[PDB]
Amino acid sequence: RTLIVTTILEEPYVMYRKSDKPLYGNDRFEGYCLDLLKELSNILGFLYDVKLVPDGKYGAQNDKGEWNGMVKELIDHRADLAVAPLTITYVREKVIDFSKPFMTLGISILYRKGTPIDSADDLAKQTKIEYGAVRDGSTMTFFKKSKISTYEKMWAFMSSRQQSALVKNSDEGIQRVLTTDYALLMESTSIEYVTQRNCNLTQIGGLIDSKGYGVGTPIGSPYRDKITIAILQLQEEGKLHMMKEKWWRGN
């Protein structure tokens, strides 16, 4: 059985290789998730075929309980595994299984260096520095559903200034931090990726929430626990660290 692996284009997890050489099948791709998949294949001993998810979505549910994205590929048994920066969540666990996480991350703050600002409190108790998040993304949702006193104030701040505090996308948000007295709330993985490449930017404070990326499988898949095992081995031997450094390290 050659396993079908659903995944999604997302830098630096999954990208097309910058090459016109005759590369076919799995060889067309590179990135952290491709390296992880290669290690998993070698530990477990499986053949695999990487397939980009056709609708280009991670996976969410409609009012009819119908799913899309990589999650739907697994549910429909059109993929054996999903190896991507796919968040392990309560709603997804109802319909698919996940290995234990290969990466743990959380919302944090991206801002300029050399400022007194040190945490989320330093932003909430002031208005001279604008702060927001990518509109309609996981990060904004967190602040909109959070009952944590301090994050309720931040959302009340971001929302009252929806037009200029909530950006269109990461690229826009990053440029906004670079070109104005602005702080962007974004996942720690992305902040790390951007700060490695912009010496003028830095992360502020610690993790605001916590979640992990896991390998998705259909419910009952006999590969799930084996993949967890392999992940732990990689973690313990320092391979996940070197895999992360390989892709994240900048100049």
Binding residues for ligand UBC, per CB under 6 A? Answer: 10, 58, 85-87, 134, 137-139, 170, 186-187, 190
Q: How far is the CB of 47 from ligand UBC (least distance, A)?
A: 26
87 labeled part of a ligand binding site: yes
DSSP class of 10? B
Place of tokens 């900048």: 250
Q: State yes or no: 161 annotated in a binding site.
A: no
User: Least distance in Å: CB of 92 to ligand UBC?
Assistant: 8
- Could you tell me how far CA 107 lies from the centroid of its own chain? 10
CB of 87 to ligand UBC, least distance (A): 4
Q: How many CB atoms lie within 10 A of CB 241?
A: 11
1 is in an annotated binding site: no
Nearest residue to ligand UBC, by Cβ distance, number only? 137
Compute CA distances 79 → 58, 164, 179, 214, whole Å: 13, 41, 43, 15
Q: Which is nearer to ligand UBC, 114 or 165 (CB)?
A: 165
Nearer to ligand UBC, 129 or 212 (CB): 212
| Least distance in angstroms from the C-beta of 103 to ligand UBC | 10
- Report the candidate in 28, 25, 50 with the shortest Cα–Cα distance to residue 37: 50
Listed in sequence order, the residues at least 6 apart from 31 whose beta carbon sits closer than 8 Å to its beta carbon are: 11, 12, 13, 14, 15, 247
| 28 annotated as a binding-site residue | no
The answer to whether 79 and 70 have CB atoms below 8 angstroms apart is yes
Tell me if 22 is assigned to a ligand binding site. no
Binding residue per annotation — 138? yes
Whole-number Å distance between alpha carbons of 9 and 128:
37
Nearer to ligand UBC, 40 or 134 (CB): 134
Would you say 85 or 132 has its CB closer to ligand UBC? 85
- CA-wise closest residue to 117 among 182, 210, 200: 182
Q: How far apart are CB 88 and ligand UBC at their closest, in Å?
A: 8
User: Distance (Å, rounded) from C-alpha 40 to C-alpha 42?
Assistant: 5
- Which residues make up each annotated binding site for L-glutamate? 85, 87, 92, 138-139, 187
- Which residues make up each annotated binding site? 85, 87, 92, 138-139, 187
